[PDB]
Amino acid sequence: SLSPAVQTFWKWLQEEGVITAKTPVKASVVTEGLGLVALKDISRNDVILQVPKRLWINPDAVAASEIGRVCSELKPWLSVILFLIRERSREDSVWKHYFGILPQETDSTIYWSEEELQELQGSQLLKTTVSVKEYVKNECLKLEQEIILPNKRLFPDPVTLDDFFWAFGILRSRAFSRLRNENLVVVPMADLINHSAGVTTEDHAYEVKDYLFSLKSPLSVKAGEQVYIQYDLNKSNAELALDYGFIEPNENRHAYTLTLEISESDPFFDDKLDVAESNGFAQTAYFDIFYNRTLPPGLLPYLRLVALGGTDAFLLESLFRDTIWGHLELSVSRDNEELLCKAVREACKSALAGYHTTIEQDRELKEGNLDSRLAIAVGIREGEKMVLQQIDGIFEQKELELDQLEYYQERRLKDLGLCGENGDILENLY
Numbered sequence: 570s571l572s573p574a575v576q577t578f579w580k581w582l583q584e585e586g587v588i589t590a591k592t593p594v595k596a597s598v599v600t601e602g603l604g605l606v607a608l609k610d611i612s613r614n615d616v617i618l619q620v621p622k623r624l625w626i627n628p629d630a631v632a633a634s635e636i637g638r639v640c641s642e643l644k645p646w647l648s649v650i651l652f653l654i655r656e657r658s659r660e661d662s663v664w665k666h667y668f669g670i671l672p673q674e675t676d677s678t679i680y681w682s683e684e685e686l687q688e689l690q691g692s693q694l695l696k697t698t699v700s701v702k703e704y705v706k707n708e709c710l711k712l713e714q715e716i717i718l719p720n721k722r723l724f725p726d727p728v729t730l731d732d733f734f735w736a737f738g739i740l741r742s743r744a745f746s747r748l749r750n751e752n753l754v755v756v757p758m759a760d761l762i763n764h765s766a767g768v769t770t771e772d773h774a775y776e777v778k779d780y781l782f783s784l785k786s787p788l789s790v791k792a793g794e795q796v797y798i799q800y801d802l803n804k805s806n807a808e809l810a811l812d813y814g815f816i817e818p819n820e821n822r823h824a825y826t827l828t829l830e831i832s833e834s835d836p837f838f839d840d841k842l843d844v845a846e847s848n849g850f851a852q853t854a855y856f857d858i859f860y861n862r863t864l865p866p867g868l869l870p871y872l873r874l875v876a877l878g879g880t881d882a883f884l885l886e887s888l889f890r891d892t893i894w895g896h897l898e899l900s901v902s903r904d905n906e907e908l909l910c911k912a913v914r915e916a917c918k919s920a921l922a923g924y925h926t927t928i929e930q931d932r933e934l935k936e937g938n939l940d941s942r943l944a945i946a947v948g949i950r951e952g953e954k955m956v957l958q959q960i961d962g963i964f965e966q967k968e969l970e971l972d973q974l975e976y977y978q979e980r981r982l983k984d985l986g987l988c989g990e991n992g993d994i995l996e997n998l999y
């Protein structure tokens with residue numbers, strides 16, 4: 570008892586030369602929706618399935634279609650969305666049966682209702698998803714007026730936001746980008762292999778090799794067990810939440826990104842910006858802070874630069890434009906260190922007060938049964954509160970050790986050599 574549409578999709582892949590007689594993997598209904606359950610014992614690196622470039626849905630595909638003309642300037646994703654939306658309506662679309670399997674929605678925060686989003690109140694994930702929905706919105710209303718509307722012929726039916734977001738979703742939760750020379754590919758078959766924290770090797774279990782999408786199973790899977798792969802070792806839980814409809818219990822995935830910038834209202838803007846760029850940092854810089862990881866290199870120096878101030882402004886002079894970062898890296902002055910510490914700490918406290926539940930309430934909730942979306946909200950907001958508190962702790966410590974640091978002035982007088990020789994003896998020798 571599988572499914573009708575699934576029944577067809579499985580057939581359509583046989584009638585294309587994709588699923589041969591030797592494919593140790595059938596489709597089945599798993600907890601995570603639809604997945605690929607081994608049809609028999611599989612081993613590490615055992616190729617599971619292969620698809621012909623004939624069936625990709627990448628920018629090259631949209632460029633080789635009727636709309637490739639009008640989308641010539643559009644960024645890659647915008648182009649695929651319109652292509653996806655359009656192909657979706659075409660009764661004669663190549664992916665008629667593949668589109669027949671695509672869930673109309675995932676648990677990504679982009680599809681959450683307003684109530685559902687209140688559960689993420691104060692969370693960065695919220696700020697991020699809001700910010701992303703809007704941008705994707707304006708960029709799609711811009712496509713509606715620049716490409717969609719001006720070409721009513723190519724785009725028959727009307728296109729609503731629910732259509733864009735549907736595509737922006739299918740794209741961001743299924744596209745294999747870790748591929749080489751193809752950084753956005755939609756492969757119908759390998760599109761069913763789900764994620765598992767069990768896979769830890771990563772680095773494309775799939776490979777470009779008619780053409781083919783040879784996807785080799787990273788783990789030894791016994792008969793009847795689902796085949797998995799690692800979606801992304803580096804993404805944070807906030808990212809997994811938005812990109813796919815899930816997060817991991819692993820606290821090491823919890824991250825909170827701080828955004829620093831050298832304000833233009835800063836009286837030394839030009840010089841500071843100069844130093845930042847001379848060392849790889851822009852006017853605005855984002856530092857990702859993960860749970861239990863050491864602060865990102867550069868966060869401190871950049872913070873010290875941002876809080877420089879008139880007193881230590883001499884470090885911006887040409888004299889130091891070669892060691893200034895080394896000094897920022899080491900430390901500038903107690904006044905400067907103390908300042909940045911309060912700024913970071915106040916921001917954490919301020920941020921933490923933005924949430925509507927305590928970490929205790931989130932953890933108690935995790936102890937019961939939560940629907941997919943609430944579970945995601947609770948999990949994410951707990952992690953953020955954890956990182957936020959970790960950061961606050963790291964800097965609360967710095968505030969105490971505010972005198973253990975040997976700042977610029979001290980470092981300068983470290984080489985004074987007061988106790989040398991009685992030089993005056995030689996002075997009189999010439």
Ligand SMILES: Nc1ncnc2c1ncn2[C@@H]1O[C@H](CSCC[C@H](N)C(=O)O)[C@@H](O)[C@H]1O
Nearest residue numbers: 601602603675742760761763764813814815
């Ligand atoms: N480990 C996991 N936990 C929860 N959902 C998962 C998951 N791995 C994959 N998914 C789901 O499947 C999507 C990836 S594409 C995989 C096919 C999908 N299961 C289907 O029924 O068509 C994700 O966006 C997510 O909604």
